[PDB]
Amino acid sequence: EHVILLNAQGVPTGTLEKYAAHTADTRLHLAFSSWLFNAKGQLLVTRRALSKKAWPGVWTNSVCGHPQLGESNEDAVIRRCRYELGVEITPPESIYPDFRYRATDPSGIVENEVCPVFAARTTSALQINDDEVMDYQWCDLADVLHGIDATPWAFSPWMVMQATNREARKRLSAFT
Ligand SMILES: CN(C)CCOP(=O)(O)OP(=O)(O)O
Ligand SMILES: [Mg+2]
Ligand SMILES: [Mn+2]
Known part of the structure; x- marks a missing residue:
């Protein structure tokens, strides 16, 4: 696996x-x-495994990852859902196409990403890959946005920043 590097203008450099x-x-x-929702409209929140290099043991949105050369964002969403969670999904929908952030984890590993955000509904049962996910919960979106606004440090920085964007929050709601 690789990541696709980008310049300040969002142009791939290698x-x-x-x-x-x-x-x-x-x-x-x-x-x-990607923010994954079940048939009941509940959000899948996941706790990243202790083996993850960046933010291990951290609560976060359903599935995140890194698209590879020649892959669309949406196929990246699909592949990681199957890979991390064992799960089939509906076509991912755009929620926050221009999200970009930089952040430092407790051991000082930085994420520096142009990070488009998607939403989808799950269409099969989870089958958890415990190399990726150590814990999960199905819950009410509004409950999660209240935890995020009250205790942001309890969640990943990209989750909090994503959920705190006015329009991104409004689209996630409408989605449910
Ligand atoms: C929001 N970022 C962290 C994009 C994906 O992050 P991961 O750390 O889940 O990446 P991967 O599943 O590719 O290891
Ligand atoms: Mg991931
Ligand atoms: Mn990254």
């Missing part, structure tokens, strides 16, 4: 091996986030 790309000074690169 690739780097995924694990090696995330450091104390992570170069800007291509990622996605």
Whole structure:
């Protein structure tokens, strides 16, 4: 696996091996986030495994990852859902296409990402890959946005920043 590197204008400049790309000074690169919802409209919140290099053991939105050369964002969403969660989904929908953030984890690993955000509904049962996910919960969207506004440090920085965008929050609601 790799990440697709980008310049300040969002123009691909090459690739780097995924694990090696995330450091104390992570170069800007291509990622996605997806918010997964069940038939009942409940959001899937996941706790990343303790083995993840960046933000291990951290509560976060359903599935995030890094698109590869030649892959659309939406196919990246699909592949990681199957890979991390064992689960089929409806076509991912755009929720926040221009999200970009940079952040430092407790051990000082930076994420530096142009990170389009998607939403989808699950269409099969989860089958959890515990190399990726250590814990999950189905819940009410509004409950999660209240935890986020009250205790942001309890969640991943990209989750909080995503959910705190006025329009992104309004689209996630409408989605449910
Ligand atoms: C929002 N960022 C973190 C994009 C995806 O992050 P992960 O750390 O889940 O990446 P991957 O599943 O590719 O290891
Ligand atoms: Mg992931
Ligand atoms: Mn990254």
